[PDB]
C-alpha cells in the first residue's frame, strides 16, 4: 500500500499540530491508566505491608485524581482526533472534486459518473474513517507498550527485563501473523466483490438469462465464485485464529515467569510485594491494548484499495487545457473549417474519424448523417473541445480551436447533447444556464422557439415548476425541448445539436427548426441526426460512413449521387 501512505501524508499536512496534540494526550491518558496499578502497588506496600490504615484511604485520593486526569485527556483527545480526521476527508474530497472538474469528456467517461461519485463521497470516507481510528484507538497499542516499559523501569527497574523481553516477542509474533494475513485478506475483498458483481449481473439480466436457457452456466459460474470466496475467507480465518491465542499465551507466560522471577527478588529483599500486583496489571493492560487494536486491522486492507482508486483519479493528468497564449478575437462568429481531422482512440486499430474535411460559412447550416457508430457521434465533441483531434485541424473563423481559450469558445456555442440532462431545481433555474440574467419575458421566448411553452405555461406557478434531479419528471421530448430552450437563450454564434431532434416527433422537429430559422437567421447551425426529415432544409448535408466522408452537398444533389445516402433515405418513406 504505497499509495495509501503517499495519499495519507499529502492531505493531512495542515493537521500536524493537531495530531501532535493527540499523540501527546494519548500518552498522558495511557501513562495515567498505567499509573493506577503503580499507586495500587503503594497501597499494598505502604498501607498493607504495615498497619498504616490511613495510608490506604489517603492514597485513594491520588487514584481518584489520576482517573480524572486520564479522562479529561481522553475525551479531550477524541476531540482533536476526530477534528483532524474530518479535515482530512474534507480536503481530500475537495481535491478529488477539484481535479475531476478539470477532466475532459474522454477522461470523465473513462471512470464514469457513478464510479466517480462513489470514488469521492463514500470512497474518501474509508480513509477518513481510518485516520480517526488510527489516532484514537490504534496508536494506544504501541503507546501502552513503550510507556509500559518505561513505567516498569520507573518501578523496581531490576525486573524490567521481563517487559523488555515480553514485548519484542508480542509485536514480533504479531507481525508474522499480520504479515501472512494481509495479502490473503486484501485478496478476499477483491473476491467478495467478485460475487456481489456476479449476483448483480444475474439479477439485472434475469429476463434474458432465462431466454437463452443459460441457467446451467449460471449457478455454476456462481458455484465457482462462492466456493472460491469460501476458500479465501476460510484461509484468512486460519491466520486470524492465531491472534488471540498467541497474544494471550505470551502475556500469560510472561505473567507466570513474572511471579517466579519476582519472588526470587522479594525473598532476596531487593523487591517489594506490590510490584508484582503492578506488573500483572501492566501486562494485562498491554494485552487489552493489543487485542482490540489487532482486531480492528481489517480497515487497512479495505482502505488501501480505496486509496488506489482515489489515486487513480488524482494521477490522471488532463490533456485538454488552455494554451499559454490563447488568441482572443473580438467576435467568434461561427465559421467552422474542419480540415483533415482524424480522431483515433489510443491503441485502437481504426480511427473513429478519418480525413473528414468540410467548412460551413458564416450563417448557413450543415447536417452530418451516417449509420450508428460511423464517427458522427464524435464530430460534435471536437468543435467544442470535448476531444482532441490527433492528426487534423478544425478552426473557428480565425484560429485552430485548440489554439483558442476554451472558455471564450464555450461562451458562444449553444450545445444540445445527445441525452437531455436537466439540473435539480426549477425550470426558471434549469434554463437559466443559458444567460443567467435573462428577463422573465425573455425566458418565455426560448420556450416558444423550442416548442416547450405549452407544457410549462399550463402549470399553476408558471415557469417555476420544480424539476427533478436528472429532470426525470419530464419523460422524453419534454426534457429535450427544455434542453433546446436552454441553448436557445444564449444567442450563440454556433448552435450545436448532437442527436437532439431524434427524441422529438416529426411535427415538433419542423416547428423548432422553423423557429430557429426565423430567430437565428445568421447563426451557424450544426445538426447531427440519424433522421432525414430533419435534414432536408439544411443548407449543406454530409454523409460519413465508418469514419471517412462519402459525399458532401445538398439534399437534391446528394439523393441522386450518393448511394449510401440514397439507401439511407429509402428507409424513410411510408
Amino acid at each position: 500500500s504505497n499509495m495509501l501512505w503517499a495519499l495519507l501524508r499529502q492531505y493531512v499536512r495542515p493537521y500536524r499540530w493537531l495530531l501532535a496534540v493527540v499523540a501527546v494526550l494519548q500518552v498522558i491518558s495511557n501513562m495515567a491508566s498505567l499509573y493506577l496499578p503503580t499507586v495500587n502497588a503503594a497501597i499494598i506496600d505502604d498501607g498493607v505491608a504495615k498497619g498504616d490504615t490511613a495510608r490506604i484511604v489517603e492514597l485513594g485520593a491520588v487514584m481518584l485524581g489520576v482517573t480524572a486526569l486520564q479522562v479529561v485527556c481522553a475525551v479531550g483527545a477524541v476531540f482533536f482526533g476526530a477534528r483532524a480526521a474530518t479535515g482530512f476527508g474534507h480536503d481530500l474530497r475537495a481535491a478529488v472534486f477539484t481535479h475531476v472538474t478539470t477532466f475532459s469528456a474522454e477522461e470523465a467517461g473513462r471512470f464514469g459518473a457513478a464510479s466517480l461519485l462513489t470514488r469521492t463521497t463514500n470512497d474518501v470516507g474509508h480513509i477518513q474513517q481510518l485516520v480517526q481510528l488510527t489516532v484514537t484507538m490504534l496508536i494506544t497499542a504501541p503507546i501502552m507498550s513503550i510507556g509500559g516499559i518505561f513505567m516498569a523501569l520507573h518501578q523496581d527497574a531490576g525486573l524490567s527485563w521481563l517487559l523488555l523481553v515480553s514485548v519484542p516477542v508480542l509485536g514480533l509474533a504479531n507481525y508474522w501473523i499480520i504479515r501472512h494475513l494481509m495479502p490473503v485478506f486484501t485478496r478476499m475483498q477483491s473476491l467478495i466483490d467478485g460475487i456481489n458483481r456476479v449476483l448483480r449481473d444475474q439479477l439485472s439480466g434475469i429476463r434474458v438469462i432465462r431466454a437463452f436457457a443459460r441457467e446451467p452456466l449460471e449457478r455454476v459460474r456462481f458455484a465457482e465464485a462462492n466456493q472460491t470466496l469460501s476458500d479465501s475467507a476460510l484461509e484468512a480465518g486460519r491466520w486470524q485464529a492465531l491472534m488471540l491465542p498467541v497474544t494471550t499465551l505470551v502475556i500469560n507466560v510472561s505473567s507466570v515467569a513474572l511471579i517466579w522471577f519476582g519472588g526470587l527478588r522479594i525473598d532476596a529483599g531487593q523487591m517489594q510485594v506490590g510490584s508484582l500486583i503492578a506488573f500483572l496489571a501492566y501486562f494485562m493492560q498491554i494485552l487489552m491494548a493489543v487485542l482490540m487494536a489487532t482486531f480492528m486491522l481489517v480497515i487497512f486492507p479495505r482502505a488501501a484499495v480505496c486509496a488506489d482508486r482515489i489515486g487513480e483519479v488524482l494521477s490522471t493528468q488532463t490533456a485538454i487545457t488552455n494554451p499559454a497564449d490563447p488568441v482572443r478575437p473580438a467576435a467568434i462568429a461561427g465559421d467552422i473549417g474542419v480540415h483533415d481531422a482524424t480522431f483515433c482512440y489510443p491503441g485502437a486499430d481504426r480511427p473513429v474519424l478519418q480525413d473528414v474535411s468540410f467548412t460551413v460559412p458564416r450563417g448557413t447550416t450543415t447536417a452530418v448523417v451516417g449509420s450508428t457508430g460511423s464517427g458522427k457521434s464524435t464530430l460534435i465533441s471536437l468543435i467544442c473541445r470535448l476531444y482532441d483531434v490527433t492528426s487534423g485541424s478544425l478552426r473557428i473563423d480565425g484560429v485552430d480551436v485548440r489554439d483558442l481559450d476554451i472558455e471564450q469558445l464555450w461562451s458562444a456555442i449553444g450545445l444540445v447533447p445527445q441525452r437531455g440532462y436537466l439540473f435539480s431545481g426549477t425550470v426558471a433555474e434549469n434554463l437559466r444556464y443559458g444567460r443567467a440574467d435573462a428577463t422573465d419575458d425573455e425566458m418565455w421566448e426560448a420556450l416558444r422557439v423550442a416548442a416547450a411553452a405549452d407544457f410549462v405555461r399550463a402549470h399553476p406557478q408558471g415557469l417555476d415548476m420544480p424539476v427533478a434531479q436528472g429532470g426525470i419528471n419530464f419523460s422524453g421530448g419534454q426534457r429535450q425541448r427544455l434542453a433546446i430552450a436552454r441553448a436557445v437563450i444564449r444567442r450563440p454564434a454556433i448552435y450545436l445539436f448532437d442527436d437532439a431532434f431524434s427524441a422529438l416527433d416529426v411535427h415538433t422537429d419542423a416547428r423548432v427548426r422553423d423557429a430557429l430559422r426565423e430567430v437565428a437567421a445568421d447563426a451557424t447551425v450544426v445538426i447531427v441526426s440519424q433522421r432525414i426529415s430533419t435534414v432536408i432544409e439544411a443548407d449543406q448535408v454530409v454523409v460519413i460512413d465508418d469514419g471517412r466522408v462519402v459525399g458532401i452537398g445538398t439534399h437534391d444533389t446528394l439523393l441522386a449521387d450518393c448511394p449510401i445516402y440514397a439507401e439511407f433515405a429509402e428507409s424513410q418513406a411510408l
Binding site: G89, M137, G373, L415, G470, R490, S571
Partner: protein
C-alpha cells in the same frame, strides 16, 4: 423494521443444525477454555500469597506460634498489623518455601498452555462451521433466484432484491460469527468471572456490578443524545452525493454554459457544512468509551481501596486481591463493546429475516417435461386475455395468427401491450383464459427451458454482464469458436465499431471509456441472439437506438433473409416495418386492424392516421 426477533433468531440458529457436531464442540470448547483462564488468576494469587506469607513471616521470632506472634504484635500497639498477621497463614521463622511456589507456577503455566490450544481449536472449528453454513445459504439463495417468477423480480424496488442477496448475507455472516465467538465468550466472562469474583469477597463484587447500570445508562444517554447529530450528518452527506451526482452526470453541460465556478462554489459551501456535521457525530459517538472506561476506573479505585483496607484488617488475603484486580479487568471489558455488539446484532438479525422471507416465497409453476420442438412456426394466439394485477386488464381478446415463414410485425402506441405480449410468448408470465399455441402444440404445457431455448428474443433494454464484448456475443452459444462469433458479429454490424474501440472484442464492457453508444450496445445484444441460431425470432424494439438503415439491414439479413424461421418485429419506426408480412396495429390489447402494408394503408384507419405522424409530419 425488524418486525420479528424470536422466530427469526430460532430459524437462523437452526440453520446451524447440519453443523451441530462442529457447534457443540465449539460451545463446550469455549467453556473449558474460558473457565481455565478464570481459575488461572486464583492459582497465580496463591503463588503470590505463598511469597507474602513467608516474606512478612520470616522476620518474626522463630519458634513462636502464629497466635502467640499475633498476640505479641497486638500487645505492642500494632493493631492493624496484628489483624493482618491473623488474616493469613504464616509460620514464624520459615522463609518462602520456593518448592510450593514453583509447583503452583508449574500448574498455572500448564493450564495456561492448555488454554491457548483449547482456544485456537475453538476458533478454527468456529471458522469452519461458519464458512460452511454461509456457503449453504449463498447456494440456496442462488438456487432460489433461478426459480422465482418474473412477477417477483419486476414488482420490487430498483435495488430491493440486490441489497438482499448481497448486503444482507454479509450481515448474516457477521452476526453469526460474532454471536458465537464475541458474544458468547463475553457472557461466560461475565458469569464465571463473576462467580469466581464472588467466592473471593461478596462485598467487593458489589462495587463492580453497580458499574454495569452506570456504564449502560451513560452509553444509552450518549447514543440517545447524539441523535440530532447522527441524522443531521447522514442527511448533510446526502446533499453532497446529490450535488456530485448532478455535477458529474451533467458534466458536459456544466463545462459548456460555464457554470464550473458556480458548481464548485456550491460544492465548497456544502462540504464545509458536512465537515462540521460529521465532526459532532464522530466526537459524541466517539466519546462513548472514554466514558464507559471512566466507570471502569471509578470501580477499580473503590475495589483497590477497599481490598487494601480489608487485607489490612485480615478479612481477606493479598493473593485474593491480586486475582480480584484481574477479574475486575476481565469483567469491565465486555461492557466497553456491548453497544458495538448489540447494534451489529439487531442489524444482522434484521437483515436475516428478509433473506428467509425471500426463501419463503412461491416458486415457479413447476413446468411439465415434454421437450416441444418448433417445426415450422404457427405461433397462433387464441383469445389471450392476460392481466397483470386483477382489476386492470392489460391485453384483451386477440387472435393474431402467424405463418410458417412470414415476419408478422406488431405496431402500436406506447403502452399498448407489446413488450407484455413478448413476455407472454416467452412464458415469463402466464396467459389467462387463452391458448398461445406454437405449431399446434400448446406451450402452456411444455417445459419452459425447451421453449425458451428455441425462441430467441431481444428486448428494448440491453443486458451486458461484466466481460469482454467477445464473451457477451458468445453468450448465446458458449460452445462456438471465434470463427462463428466473428462470423455472426458481422451480420449485426458490431465489427465496424468494435475496431474503433481501443482493444476490440476485449473491451471488458463493465469498466470502459464510455465509447460504446446506446445503439452500439444493442448491436452487441443482437449479435448475441444471432449466435443461438433461433427458429422463432422476436425483436421487441431491439433496434430502437440504432440507425434506421442498420435497422433495415439487420431485419432483412437475419429476419427476412431467413426463409426457414418466422419473426416478430416490434418497433416504433414504421419505415422499417412497412412491407413486412402482416403488420398488426394494436392499442392496449384488442388488435384493431391488420394486414400487409398496402391493404392496411389503403383503408383509411388508425394505421393510416398513424403513418402521417411519421411521414406526413402532422401532429
Amino acid at each position: 423494521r425488524t418486525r420479528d426477533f424470536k422466530g427469526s433468531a430460532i430459524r437462523l440458529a437452526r440453520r446451524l443444525l447440519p453443523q451441530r457436531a462442529l457447534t457443540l464442540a465449539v460451545i463446550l470448547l469455549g467453556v473449558g477454555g474460558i473457565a481455565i483462564g478464570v481459575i488461572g488468576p486464583r492459582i497465580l494469587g496463591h503463588a503470590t500469597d505463598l511469597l507474602f506469607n513467608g516474606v512478612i513471616g520470616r522476620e518474626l521470632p522463630a519458634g513462636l506460634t502464629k497466635e502467640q506472634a499475633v498476640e505479641a504484635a497486638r500487645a505492642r500497639g500494632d493493631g492493624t498489623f496484628a489483624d493482618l498477621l491473623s488474616g493469613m497463614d504464616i509460620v514464624p521463622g520459615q522463609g518462602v518455601d520456593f518448592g510450593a511456589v514453583g509447583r503452583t507456577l508449574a500448574l498455572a503455566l500448564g493450564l495456561y498452555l492448555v488454554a491457548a490450544l483449547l482456544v485456537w481449536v475453538q476458533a478454527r472449528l468456529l471458522n469452519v462451521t461458519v464458512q460452511r453454513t454461509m456457503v449453504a445459504l449463498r447456494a440456496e439463495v442462488q438456487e432460489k433466484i433461478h426459480r422465482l417468477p418474473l412477477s417477483y423480480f419486476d414488482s420490487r424496488q430498483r435495488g430491493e432484491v440486490l441489497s438482499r442477496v448481497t448486503n444482507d448475507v454479509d450481515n448474516i455472516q457477521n452476526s453469526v460469527s460474532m454471536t458465537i465467538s464475541q458474544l458468547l465468550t463475553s457472557v461466560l466472562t461475565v458469569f464465571a468471572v463473576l462467580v469466581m469474583m464472588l467466592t473471593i469477597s461478596p462485598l467487593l463484587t458489589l462495587f463492580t456490578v453497580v458499574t454495569v447500570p452506570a456504564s449502560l445508562w451513560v452509553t444509552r444517554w450518549i447514543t440517545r443524545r447524539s441523535q440530532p447529530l447522527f441524522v443531521a450528518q447522514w442527511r448533510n452527506t446526502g446533499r453532497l452525493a446529490a450535488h456530485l451526482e448532478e455535477t458529474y452526470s451533467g458534466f458536459t453541460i456544466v463545462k459548456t454554459f460555464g457554470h464550473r465556478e458556480a458548481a464548485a462554489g456550491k460544492f465548497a459551501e456544502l462540504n464545509s457544512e458536512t465537515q462540521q456535521s460529521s465532526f459532532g457525530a464522530q466526537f459524541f459517538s466517539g466519546l462513548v468509551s472514554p466514558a464507559t472506561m471512566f466507570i471502569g476506573n471509578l470501580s477499580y479505585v473503590a475495589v483497590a481501596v477497599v481490598g487494601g483496607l480489608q487485607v489490612a484488617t485480615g478479612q481477606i488475603t493479598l493473593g485474593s486481591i491480586q486475582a480480584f484486580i484481574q477479574y475486575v479487568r476481565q469483567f469491565n471489558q465486555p461492557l466497553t463493546q456491548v453497544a458495538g455488539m448489540y447494534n451489529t446484532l439487531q442489524s444482522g438479525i434484521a437483515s436475516a429475516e428478509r433473506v428467509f422471507d425471500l426463501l419463503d416465497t412461491e416458486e415457479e409453476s413447476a413446468d411439465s417435461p415434454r421437450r416441444a420442438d418448433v417445426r415450422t412456426g404457427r405461433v397462433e394466439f387464441e383469445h389471450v386475455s392476460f392481466s397483470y394485477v386483477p382489476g386492470t386488464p392489460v391485453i384483451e381478446d386477440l387472435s393474431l395468427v402467424a405463418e410458417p415463414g412470414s415476419t408478422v410485425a406488431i405496431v402500436g402506441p406506447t403502452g399498448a401491450g407489446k413488450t407484455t405480449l413478448v413476455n407472454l410468448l416467452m412464458r415469463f408470465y402466464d396467459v389467462d383464459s387463452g391458448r398461445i399455441t406454437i405449431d399446434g402444440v400448446d406451450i402452456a404445457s411444455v417445459s419452459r427451458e425447451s421453449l425458451r431455448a428455441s425462441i430467441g428474443m431481444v428486448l428494448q433494454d440491453t443486458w451486458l454482464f461484466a466481460g469482454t464484448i467477445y464473451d457477451n456475443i458468445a453468450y448465446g452459444r458458449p460452445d462456438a469458436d471465434e470463427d462463428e462469433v466473428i462470423e455472426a458479429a458481422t451480420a449485426a454490424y458490431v465489427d465496424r465499431f468494435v475496431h474503433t474501440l481501443p482493444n476490440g472484442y476485449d473491451t471488458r464492457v463493465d469498466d470502459d471509456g464510455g465509447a460504446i453508444s446506446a445503439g452500439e450496445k444493442q448491436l452487441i445484444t443482437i449479435a448475441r441472439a444471432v449466435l443461438a441460431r433461433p427458429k422463432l425470432l422476436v425483436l421487441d424494439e431491439a433496434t430502437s437506438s440504432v440507425d434506421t438503415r442498420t435497422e433495415l439491414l439487420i431485419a432483412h439479413a437475419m429476419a427476412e433473409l431467413r426463409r426457414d424461421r418466422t419473426s416478430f418485429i416490434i418497433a416504433h419506426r414504421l419505415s422499417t416495418i412497412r412491407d413486412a408480412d402482416l403488420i398488426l396495429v394494436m392499442d392496449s390489447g384488442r388488435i384493431i386492424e391488420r394486414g400487409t402494408h398496402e391493404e392496411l394503408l389503403a383503408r383509411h384507419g388508425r394505421y393510416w392516421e398513424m403513418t402521417r405522424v411519421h411521414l406526413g409530419g402532422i401532429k
